[PDB]
Structure formats: structure tokens, C-alpha cells
Design a protein around this ligand. Structure first.
Ligand SMILES: CCCCCC(=O)OC[C@H](COP(=O)(O)OCC[N+](C)(C)C)OC(=O)CCCCC
Ligand SMILES: CCCCCC(=O)OC[C@H](COP(=O)(O)OCC[N+](C)(C)C)OC(=O)CCCCC
Ligand SMILES: CCCCCC(=O)OC[C@H](COP(=O)(O)OCC[N+](C)(C)C)OC(=O)CCCCC
Length: 177
């Protein structure tokens, strides 16, 4: 149960993500991310785009139906104080792309936690433009310590939870609609 790994989806919960979170050490801004694939189809990792921060971890390469991937990120170590803000992109075996946004900002005087989930038609890499769409234009969810559900189209739906703090967990379940 480490970041970079896949577990059984039914075992995804706050406990597993907290353990991933706690393993990163005392850093101001950091995130544990778990995405449970119940979509009926296998996911293959494309890439992650980091608008801010980074990860030492490889995206789990293959994530089968019934499995959850565990991932994490943290703020830049270097001289520029950043949050951790990015987009994970997975290829689904229908030819389409599952994209997940997380934003855990540095400066809470101006910003707060957000996340989003969207299915993109065809094969699309995570990048700056994708981040802008998901952050500014596709109705992202607040990290408000509550669950939010939404149809993704393609017969899939998402149910997800993100906490409100700079020590952030993001838990998402992708199911059949
Ligand atoms: C003029 C913008 C000031 C907003 C507060 C801030 O912390 O800037 C965001 C950024 C990093 O914060 P971050 O939370 O990662 O980005 C804002 C969150 N987003 C990108 C989602 C809007 O700060 C920097 O590193 C820019 C250079 C700072 C002085 C050298
Ligand atoms: C000289 C104009 C000052 C405003 C700079 C700006 O438009 O940056 C917006 C950007 C918000 O970043 P982002 O979410 O990536 O969106 C910017 C890209 N656009 C404008 C296309 C949406 O704020 C930052 O955190 C960058 C740090 C600026 C301090 C040096
Ligand atoms: C005295 C505190 C003022 C409170 C700030 C506020 O109302 O929200 C600020 C909003 C930040 O909100 P944003 O995350 O871009 O919008 C959240 C709504 N979504 C996620 C849909 C874009 O704009 C910025 O911070 C841009 C750069 C400021 C330069 C000083």
C-alpha cells in the first residue's frame, strides 16, 4: 500500500491515503491520490502534467477494472514556493482518456483546494491547456470535505472526495452510470 502501486479497489479509503500522505514527511503542501477503476475497462498510464510541484513516483502503468491506483505529489523543494497542482492522464482501452485534476495551492489568502474528473474523447496527453480547461472551464469540485458525484458520459460516472487542507487526500471512484 504505497504510492506507485495498485491495490484492490474495494480497499481504497481514507486510511490507505492517509498512510501514503504521512509517508511524504513534514512538507507544507502535499497530496495522496487514489483513483478506483470500476469502469469495466483497463487503464494504461499516459503522463502527469504538473502546473506546480512534482512527484517522485511513477504512475501505475496498468490499472485493471476492480483495481485502485495510489499516487502522490508535493510542492517544489527548490527556491520557488509552490503548491501541488496537476493533471493525471490515463488511456482507457476504448481509445479515450481519463483526466484527473488536483490543486493544493501554496497561498490560501487567494486560493483553495480544487479537483476535477473528465473523460476526453480520444488520446490526449496531460498538459497546460488541459489543466486550464479542468481548473477554469469544466466546473471543478472544491476540496471541501464532502462527496460530489457527476456523470462523465461514455456510460461512466465519478464519485469523489477531497479534504480542505494543505495536507490533502483525493479519493475518486469511476463507476458505470
Ligand atoms: C501574482 C500571483 C500571486 C498568487 C500567490 C502565489 O503564491 O503565486 C502562485 C505561485 C505558486 O503557487 P501555486 O499555489 O502553486 O499556484 C497558484 C495555484 N493555481 C495555479 C491553481 C492558480 O507563486 C509562485 O511561485 C510565483 C512566483 C512567486 C515569487 C517568485
Ligand atoms: C503581468 C500580469 C500579471 C498577471 C500574471 C498572470 O496572468 O498569471 C496568472 C497565473 C495563474 O496561472 P494559470 O492557472 O496557469 O493561468 C495562467 C494562464 N492563463 C492566463 C492563460 C489562464 O498566476 C500565477 O500564479 C503565476 C505567478 C504570477 C506571479 C509572477
Ligand atoms: C483579500 C483576499 C481576497 C480573496 C481572493 C478571491 O476572492 O479569490 C481570488 C481568485 C483566485 O481564485 P481561482 O482559484 O483562480 O478561482 C477559483 C474558481 N475556479 C477554480 C473555478 C477557477 O483570484 C486570484 O487569486 C487570481 C490571482 C490573484 C493575484 C493577486
Amino acid at each position: 500500500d504505497v504510492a506507485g502501486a495498485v491495490i484492490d479497489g474495494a480497499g481504497l479509503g481514507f486510511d490507505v491515503l492517509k498512510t501514503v500522505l504521512e509517508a511524504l514527511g513534514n512538507v507544507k503542501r502535499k497530496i495522496a491520490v487514489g483513483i478506483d477503476n470500476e469502469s469495466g475497462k483497463t487503464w494504461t498510464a499516459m503522463n502527469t502534467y504538473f502546473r506546480s510541484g512534482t512527484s517522485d513516483i511513477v504512475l501505475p502503468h496498468k490499472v485493471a477494472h476492480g483495481k485502485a491506483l495510489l499516487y502522490n505529489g508535493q510542492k517544489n523543494r527548490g527556491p520557488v514556493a509552490t503548491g501541488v497542482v496537476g493533471v493525471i492522464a490515463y488511456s482507457m482501452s476504448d481509445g479515450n482518456t481519463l483526466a484527473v485534476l488536483f490543486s493544493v495551492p501554496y497561498d490560501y489568502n487567494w486560493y483553495s483546494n480544487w479537483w476535477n474528473v473528465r473523460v476526453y474523447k480520444g488520446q490526449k496527453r496531460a498538459d497546460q491547456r488541459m489543466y486550464e480547461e479542468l481548473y477554469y472551464h469544466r466546473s471543478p469540485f472544491r476540496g471541501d470535505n464532502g462527496w460530489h458525484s457527476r456523470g462523465l458520459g461514455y456510460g461512466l460516472k465519478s464519485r469523489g472526495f477531497m479534504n480542505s487542507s494543505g495536507h490533502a487526500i483525493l479519493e475518486i471512484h469511476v463507476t458505470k452510470a
